[PDB]
Amino acid sequence: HGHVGADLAALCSEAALQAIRKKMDAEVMNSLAVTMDDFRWALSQSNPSALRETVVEVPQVTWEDIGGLEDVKRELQELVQYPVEHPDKFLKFGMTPSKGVLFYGPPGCGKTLLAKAIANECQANFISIKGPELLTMWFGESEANVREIFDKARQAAPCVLFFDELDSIAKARGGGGGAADRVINQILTEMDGMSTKKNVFIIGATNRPDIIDPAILRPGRLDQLIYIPLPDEKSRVAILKANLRKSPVAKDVDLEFLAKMTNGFSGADLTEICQRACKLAIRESIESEIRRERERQTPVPEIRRDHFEEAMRFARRSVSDNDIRKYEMFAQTLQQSRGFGSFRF
Protein backbone atom coordinates (compact mmCIF):
# COMPACT_ATOMS: atom_id res chain seq x y z
CA HIS A 1 0.00 0.00 0.00
CA GLY A 2 1.37 3.36 -1.03
CA HIS A 3 3.72 1.77 -3.58
CA VAL A 4 4.31 3.44 -6.97
CA GLY A 5 5.78 1.49 -9.89
CA ALA A 6 9.35 2.37 -8.94
CA ASP A 7 8.57 1.24 -5.39
CA LEU A 8 7.32 -2.07 -6.77
CA ALA A 9 10.54 -2.38 -8.78
CA ALA A 10 12.46 -1.80 -5.55
CA LEU A 11 10.28 -4.45 -3.89
CA CYS A 12 11.05 -7.05 -6.57
CA SER A 13 14.70 -5.98 -6.46
CA GLU A 14 15.12 -6.47 -2.72
CA ALA A 15 13.17 -9.75 -2.85
CA ALA A 16 15.46 -11.06 -5.60
CA LEU A 17 18.48 -9.90 -3.60
CA GLN A 18 17.14 -11.74 -0.55
CA ALA A 19 16.88 -14.85 -2.70
CA ILE A 20 20.48 -14.24 -3.83
CA ARG A 21 21.78 -13.77 -0.27
CA LYS A 22 19.71 -16.74 0.96
CA LYS A 23 21.15 -19.13 -1.63
CA MET A 24 24.69 -17.86 -0.94
CA ASP A 25 26.94 -20.54 -2.47
CA ALA A 26 26.65 -20.82 -12.43
CA GLU A 27 23.88 -23.40 -12.76
CA VAL A 28 22.85 -22.71 -9.16
CA MET A 29 22.20 -19.14 -10.31
CA ASN A 30 19.50 -20.23 -12.76
CA SER A 31 17.86 -22.30 -9.99
CA LEU A 32 17.26 -19.30 -7.72
CA ALA A 33 13.89 -19.59 -5.98
CA VAL A 34 12.24 -16.28 -5.12
CA THR A 35 9.86 -17.63 -2.48
CA MET A 36 7.06 -15.75 -0.68
CA ASP A 37 9.27 -15.43 2.42
CA ASP A 38 11.63 -13.24 0.37
CA PHE A 39 8.72 -11.06 -0.76
CA ARG A 40 7.49 -10.75 2.83
CA TRP A 41 11.00 -9.77 3.96
CA ALA A 42 11.27 -7.20 1.16
CA LEU A 43 7.79 -5.89 1.94
CA SER A 44 8.73 -5.55 5.61
CA GLN A 45 11.90 -3.62 4.66
CA SER A 46 10.51 -1.64 1.72
CA ASN A 47 10.42 2.10 2.37
CA PRO A 48 7.45 3.39 0.34
CA SER A 49 7.27 6.99 -0.86
CA ALA A 50 3.66 7.12 -2.07
CA LEU A 51 2.13 7.36 1.40
CA ARG A 52 0.63 10.78 2.30
CA GLU A 53 -0.34 11.01 -1.37
CA THR A 54 -4.05 10.27 -1.07
CA VAL A 55 -5.25 7.41 -3.25
CA VAL A 56 -8.36 7.47 -5.43
CA GLU A 57 -9.75 3.97 -5.91
CA VAL A 58 -13.04 2.10 -6.21
CA PRO A 59 -12.94 0.31 -2.84
CA GLN A 60 -13.93 -3.29 -2.10
CA VAL A 61 -16.77 -3.42 0.43
CA THR A 62 -19.62 -4.79 -1.80
CA TRP A 63 -22.52 -3.59 0.44
CA GLU A 64 -22.68 -6.75 2.62
CA ASP A 65 -19.58 -6.26 4.72
CA ILE A 66 -21.85 -3.52 6.05
CA GLY A 67 -25.08 -5.46 6.43
CA GLY A 68 -28.41 -4.06 7.46
CA LEU A 69 -29.11 -0.33 7.13
CA GLU A 70 -31.76 -0.97 4.49
CA ASP A 71 -33.30 2.51 4.49
CA VAL A 72 -29.81 4.02 4.71
CA LYS A 73 -28.86 1.86 1.72
CA ARG A 74 -31.90 3.15 -0.17
CA GLU A 75 -31.12 6.79 0.63
CA LEU A 76 -27.49 6.35 -0.42
CA GLN A 77 -28.57 4.62 -3.63
CA GLU A 78 -31.11 7.33 -4.50
CA LEU A 79 -28.47 9.95 -3.70
CA VAL A 80 -25.38 8.52 -5.47
CA GLN A 81 -26.28 5.84 -8.01
CA TYR A 82 -29.45 7.37 -9.49
CA PRO A 83 -27.79 10.73 -10.35
CA VAL A 84 -24.92 8.97 -12.13
CA GLU A 85 -26.43 5.74 -13.49
CA HIS A 86 -29.81 7.20 -14.52
CA PRO A 87 -29.05 10.88 -15.21
CA ASP A 88 -31.67 11.32 -17.94
CA LYS A 89 -34.45 10.98 -15.37
CA PHE A 90 -33.07 13.83 -13.24
CA LEU A 91 -32.89 16.26 -16.16
CA LYS A 92 -36.37 15.12 -17.16
CA PHE A 93 -37.99 15.88 -13.80
CA GLY A 94 -35.80 18.97 -13.39
CA MET A 95 -34.27 17.86 -10.08
CA THR A 96 -30.79 19.02 -9.51
CA PRO A 97 -28.93 16.13 -7.85
CA SER A 98 -28.06 16.83 -4.24
CA LYS A 99 -24.48 18.01 -3.84
CA GLY A 100 -23.82 15.79 -0.84
CA VAL A 101 -24.99 14.02 2.29
CA LEU A 102 -23.92 14.10 5.94
CA PHE A 103 -23.79 10.91 7.99
CA TYR A 104 -24.00 11.10 11.75
CA GLY A 105 -24.30 8.70 14.64
CA PRO A 106 -22.24 6.74 17.16
CA PRO A 107 -18.49 6.45 16.54
CA GLY A 108 -17.33 3.42 14.60
CA CYS A 109 -20.76 2.01 13.73
CA GLY A 110 -20.01 1.46 10.05
CA LYS A 111 -19.94 4.98 8.61
CA THR A 112 -16.64 4.80 6.72
CA LEU A 113 -17.43 1.37 5.28
CA LEU A 114 -20.84 2.74 4.39
CA ALA A 115 -19.45 5.30 1.94
CA LYS A 116 -16.87 2.86 0.59
CA ALA A 117 -19.83 0.54 -0.02
CA ILE A 118 -21.76 3.12 -2.03
CA ALA A 119 -18.59 4.15 -3.87
CA ASN A 120 -18.16 0.50 -4.84
CA GLU A 121 -21.79 0.10 -5.93
CA CYS A 122 -21.62 3.34 -7.93
CA GLN A 123 -18.12 2.29 -9.15
CA ALA A 124 -16.92 5.79 -8.27
CA ASN A 125 -13.52 6.83 -7.00
CA PHE A 126 -13.42 7.16 -3.21
CA ILE A 127 -11.48 9.92 -1.46
CA SER A 128 -11.38 9.62 2.33
CA ILE A 129 -10.27 12.86 3.98
CA LYS A 130 -9.75 11.78 7.57
CA GLY A 131 -10.05 14.08 10.57
CA PRO A 132 -6.29 14.46 11.07
CA GLU A 133 -6.01 16.00 7.59
CA LEU A 134 -8.67 18.63 8.34
CA LEU A 135 -6.96 19.26 11.68
CA THR A 136 -3.57 19.66 9.96
CA MET A 137 -5.14 22.17 7.57
CA TRP A 138 -6.60 24.01 10.58
CA PHE A 139 -3.26 24.17 12.45
CA GLY A 140 -0.82 24.98 9.67
CA GLU A 141 -3.28 27.68 8.52
CA SER A 142 -3.14 25.93 5.13
CA GLU A 143 -6.83 26.34 4.36
CA ALA A 144 -5.94 26.40 0.64
CA ASN A 145 -4.88 22.74 0.58
CA VAL A 146 -8.56 21.74 0.46
CA ARG A 147 -8.94 23.41 -2.93
CA GLU A 148 -6.46 20.74 -4.06
CA ILE A 149 -8.64 18.00 -2.54
CA PHE A 150 -11.74 19.14 -4.42
CA ASP A 151 -9.70 19.55 -7.61
CA LYS A 152 -8.45 15.98 -7.18
CA ALA A 153 -12.06 14.86 -6.77
CA ARG A 154 -13.05 16.81 -9.89
CA GLN A 155 -10.38 15.09 -11.98
CA ALA A 156 -11.20 11.74 -10.36
CA ALA A 157 -14.93 12.11 -11.14
CA PRO A 158 -17.28 10.41 -10.39
CA CYS A 159 -16.21 10.75 -6.78
CA VAL A 160 -17.11 10.17 -3.14
CA LEU A 161 -15.50 12.82 -0.94
CA PHE A 162 -15.91 11.08 2.41
CA PHE A 163 -14.91 13.91 4.75
CA ASP A 164 -14.41 11.53 7.66
CA GLU A 165 -14.83 13.21 11.05
CA LEU A 166 -16.01 16.55 9.68
CA ASP A 167 -16.34 17.90 13.24
CA SER A 168 -12.68 17.38 14.18
CA ILE A 169 -12.07 21.14 14.33
CA ALA A 170 -15.18 21.80 16.41
CA LYS A 171 -13.93 19.28 18.95
CA ALA A 172 -10.49 20.90 18.64
CA ARG A 173 -11.89 24.27 19.75
CA GLY A 174 -14.80 23.08 21.88
CA GLY A 175 -15.94 26.21 23.68
CA GLY A 176 -14.27 33.95 21.28
CA GLY A 177 -15.51 31.67 18.52
CA GLY A 178 -18.80 29.89 17.99
CA ALA A 179 -18.80 28.51 14.42
CA ALA A 180 -17.26 28.74 10.95
CA ASP A 181 -13.78 27.20 11.20
CA ARG A 182 -10.86 28.13 8.94
CA VAL A 183 -11.00 25.21 6.53
CA ILE A 184 -14.61 24.14 7.01
CA ASN A 185 -15.46 27.52 5.48
CA GLN A 186 -13.19 26.63 2.56
CA ILE A 187 -14.99 23.29 2.25
CA LEU A 188 -18.20 25.32 2.04
CA THR A 189 -16.67 27.57 -0.63
CA GLU A 190 -15.43 24.84 -2.98
CA MET A 191 -18.51 22.77 -2.19
CA ASP A 192 -20.91 25.48 -3.37
CA GLY A 193 -18.51 26.24 -6.21
CA MET A 194 -18.83 23.09 -8.31
CA SER A 195 -22.10 22.55 -10.14
CA THR A 196 -24.41 19.58 -9.66
CA LYS A 197 -22.68 18.17 -12.73
CA LYS A 198 -19.32 16.32 -12.58
CA ASN A 199 -20.97 13.76 -10.26
CA VAL A 200 -18.87 14.58 -7.18
CA PHE A 201 -20.67 13.58 -3.99
CA ILE A 202 -19.53 14.68 -0.53
CA ILE A 203 -20.41 12.25 2.26
CA GLY A 204 -18.77 14.07 5.16
CA ALA A 205 -19.59 12.09 8.28
CA THR A 206 -19.73 13.47 11.82
CA ASN A 207 -19.63 11.65 15.14
CA ARG A 208 -21.00 14.78 16.85
CA PRO A 209 -23.67 16.29 14.58
CA ASP A 210 -24.47 19.39 16.68
CA ILE A 211 -21.03 21.00 17.08
CA ILE A 212 -20.66 21.26 13.30
CA ASP A 213 -21.06 24.52 11.39
CA PRO A 214 -24.80 25.06 10.85
CA ALA A 215 -23.90 26.58 7.47
CA ILE A 216 -22.93 23.06 6.38
CA LEU A 217 -26.50 21.79 6.76
CA ARG A 218 -28.00 24.48 4.52
CA PRO A 219 -29.63 23.30 1.27
CA GLY A 220 -27.22 23.16 -1.64
CA ARG A 221 -24.57 22.22 0.91
CA LEU A 222 -24.58 18.88 2.86
CA ASP A 223 -28.33 19.16 3.25
CA GLN A 224 -29.40 15.53 3.61
CA LEU A 225 -28.48 14.07 6.98
CA ILE A 226 -28.61 10.31 7.48
CA TYR A 227 -28.58 8.79 10.95
CA ILE A 228 -26.27 5.78 11.05
CA PRO A 229 -27.58 3.88 14.09
CA LEU A 230 -26.04 0.96 15.91
CA PRO A 231 -25.86 -2.30 13.93
CA ASP A 232 -29.09 -4.29 13.90
CA GLU A 233 -29.02 -8.09 14.28
CA LYS A 234 -28.54 -8.51 10.52
CA SER A 235 -26.04 -5.65 10.41
CA ARG A 236 -23.88 -6.93 13.24
CA VAL A 237 -23.98 -10.53 12.07
CA ALA A 238 -22.66 -9.19 8.76
CA ILE A 239 -20.06 -7.16 10.67
CA LEU A 240 -18.94 -10.27 12.58
CA LYS A 241 -18.86 -12.31 9.37
CA ALA A 242 -16.77 -9.65 7.63
CA ASN A 243 -14.31 -9.16 10.51
CA LEU A 244 -13.88 -12.95 10.73
CA ARG A 245 -13.51 -13.30 6.96
CA LYS A 246 -9.98 -14.51 6.02
CA SER A 247 -9.77 -15.68 9.63
CA PRO A 248 -9.89 -19.48 10.05
CA VAL A 249 -13.05 -19.76 12.14
CA ALA A 250 -14.63 -22.94 13.45
CA LYS A 251 -17.92 -24.36 12.19
CA ASP A 252 -19.25 -24.80 15.73
CA VAL A 253 -19.33 -21.04 16.36
CA ASP A 254 -22.67 -19.30 15.87
CA LEU A 255 -22.00 -15.74 14.73
CA GLU A 256 -25.75 -15.15 14.81
CA PHE A 257 -25.64 -16.08 18.52
CA LEU A 258 -22.94 -13.45 19.08
CA ALA A 259 -24.85 -10.91 16.99
CA LYS A 260 -27.95 -11.66 19.06
CA MET A 261 -26.17 -11.24 22.41
CA THR A 262 -24.56 -7.92 21.44
CA ASN A 263 -27.15 -5.14 21.42
CA GLY A 264 -25.50 -1.79 22.12
CA PHE A 265 -22.21 -2.89 20.58
CA SER A 266 -20.77 -0.45 18.06
CA GLY A 267 -19.05 -1.82 14.98
CA ALA A 268 -15.61 -1.10 16.42
CA ASP A 269 -16.55 -3.04 19.56
CA LEU A 270 -17.41 -5.96 17.32
CA THR A 271 -14.01 -5.69 15.69
CA GLU A 272 -12.26 -5.85 19.07
CA ILE A 273 -14.45 -8.85 19.83
CA CYS A 274 -12.90 -10.59 16.81
CA GLN A 275 -9.43 -9.03 17.22
CA ARG A 276 -9.28 -10.29 20.81
CA ALA A 277 -10.44 -13.73 19.63
CA CYS A 278 -7.80 -13.80 16.89
CA LYS A 279 -5.39 -12.60 19.59
CA LEU A 280 -6.31 -15.48 21.90
CA ALA A 281 -5.93 -17.98 19.06
CA ILE A 282 -2.53 -16.38 18.41
CA ARG A 283 -1.58 -16.84 22.07
CA GLU A 284 -2.72 -20.46 22.16
CA SER A 285 -1.09 -21.39 18.85
CA ILE A 286 2.26 -19.78 19.71
CA GLU A 287 2.18 -21.28 23.21
CA SER A 288 1.44 -24.69 21.67
CA GLU A 289 4.44 -24.33 19.35
CA ILE A 290 6.59 -23.34 22.34
CA ARG A 291 5.54 -26.33 24.47
CA ARG A 292 6.00 -28.59 21.45
CA GLU A 293 9.45 -27.39 20.41
CA ARG A 294 10.92 -27.54 23.90
CA GLU A 295 9.64 -31.05 24.72
CA ARG A 296 8.67 -33.25 21.76
CA GLN A 297 11.19 -31.74 19.36
CA THR A 298 13.78 -32.28 22.11
CA PRO A 299 -2.06 -26.68 17.00
CA VAL A 300 -5.22 -24.52 17.08
CA PRO A 301 -6.02 -24.71 13.33
CA GLU A 302 -8.95 -22.34 13.84
CA ILE A 303 -10.54 -19.93 16.30
CA ARG A 304 -12.47 -22.39 18.46
CA ARG A 305 -15.68 -21.28 20.12
CA ASP A 306 -14.08 -21.11 23.57
CA HIS A 307 -11.84 -18.36 22.22
CA PHE A 308 -15.03 -16.46 21.34
CA GLU A 309 -15.93 -16.84 25.03
CA GLU A 310 -12.63 -15.74 26.58
CA ALA A 311 -12.53 -12.79 24.17
CA MET A 312 -16.21 -12.02 24.76
CA ARG A 313 -15.62 -11.79 28.51
CA PHE A 314 -13.70 -8.60 27.66
CA ALA A 315 -16.65 -7.16 25.76
CA ARG A 316 -16.63 -3.38 26.24
CA ARG A 317 -19.74 -1.69 24.87
CA SER A 318 -17.87 1.44 23.87
CA VAL A 319 -20.76 3.76 22.99
CA SER A 320 -22.96 4.49 25.99
CA ASP A 321 -26.73 4.79 26.28
CA ASN A 322 -26.46 8.58 26.61
CA ASP A 323 -24.33 9.27 23.53
CA ILE A 324 -26.90 7.51 21.36
CA ARG A 325 -29.61 9.31 23.30
CA LYS A 326 -28.12 12.63 22.17
CA TYR A 327 -27.86 11.36 18.59
CA GLU A 328 -31.55 10.43 18.65
CA MET A 329 -32.34 13.85 20.11
CA PHE A 330 -30.60 15.31 17.08
CA ALA A 331 -32.52 12.88 14.86
CA GLN A 332 -35.91 13.96 16.21
CA THR A 333 -34.74 17.57 15.99
CA LEU A 334 -34.31 16.72 12.29
CA GLN A 335 -37.83 15.22 12.12
CA GLN A 336 -40.53 17.91 12.09
CA SER A 337 -43.40 16.15 10.33
CA ARG A 338 -45.79 17.31 13.08
CA GLY A 339 -49.29 17.09 11.62
CA PHE A 340 -48.54 17.18 7.90
CA GLY A 341 -48.89 13.42 8.01
CA SER A 342 -52.23 12.52 6.40
CA PHE A 343 -51.98 15.61 4.22
CA ARG A 344 -54.61 14.23 1.86
CA PHE A 345 -55.83 16.53 -0.87
Are 120 and 60 in contact by the 8 Å Cβ rule? The answer is yes
Span of 127-135, 226-234, 297-305, 315-323 interacting with a copy of itself by CB under 8 A:
315-323
Calpha distance 149→136 (Å, rounded)? 14
Residues 102-141 that bind a copy of itself (CB under 8 A): none
Supply the minimum distance, in Å, between the C-beta of residue 249 and a copy of itself: 22
67's CB contacts (< 8 A; 6+ apart) are 231, 234, 235, 236, 237, 238, 239, 241
Q: SS3 sequence, 253-306?
A: CCHHHHHHHCCCCCHHHHHHHHHHHHHHHHHHHHHHHHHHHCCCCCCCCCECCC
Residue 332 interacts with a copy of itself (CB under 8 A): yes or no: no
105 annotated to bind ligand: no
The radius of gyration of the chain's CA atoms, rounded to the nearest angstrom, is: 25
Q: Which is nearer to a copy of itself, 8 or 261 (CB)?
A: 261
35 in a labelled binding site: no
Which of residues 74 and 260 has its CB atom nearest to a copy of itself in the complex?
260
Q: Does 260 bind a copy of itself (CB under 8 A)?
A: yes
Residue 314 touching a copy of itself (CB under 8 A): no
State the binding string over 212-251 for a copy of itself (x if CB under 8 A, else -). Answer: ----------------------------------------
DSSP letter, residue 80: I
In the complex, the smallest distance separating the C-beta of residue 231 from a copy of itself, rounded to whole angstroms, is 16
- If one asks whether residue 321 binds a copy of itself (CB under 8 A), the answer comes out as yes
Residue 261 touches a copy of itself, criterion: CB under 8 A? yes
* Contact (Cβ atoms closer than 8 angstroms) between residue 170 and residue 70: no
Residue 263 within binding range of a copy of itself, rule CB under 8 A: yes
DSSP 169-216: HHHHT-----S--HHHHHHHHHHHSS-S-TTEEE--BBSSSSSS-TTT
309 binds a copy of itself (CB under 8 A): no
Annotated binding site: 108-113
Residues engaged in binding a copy of itself (CB under 8 A): 260-261, 263-264, 317, 320-322
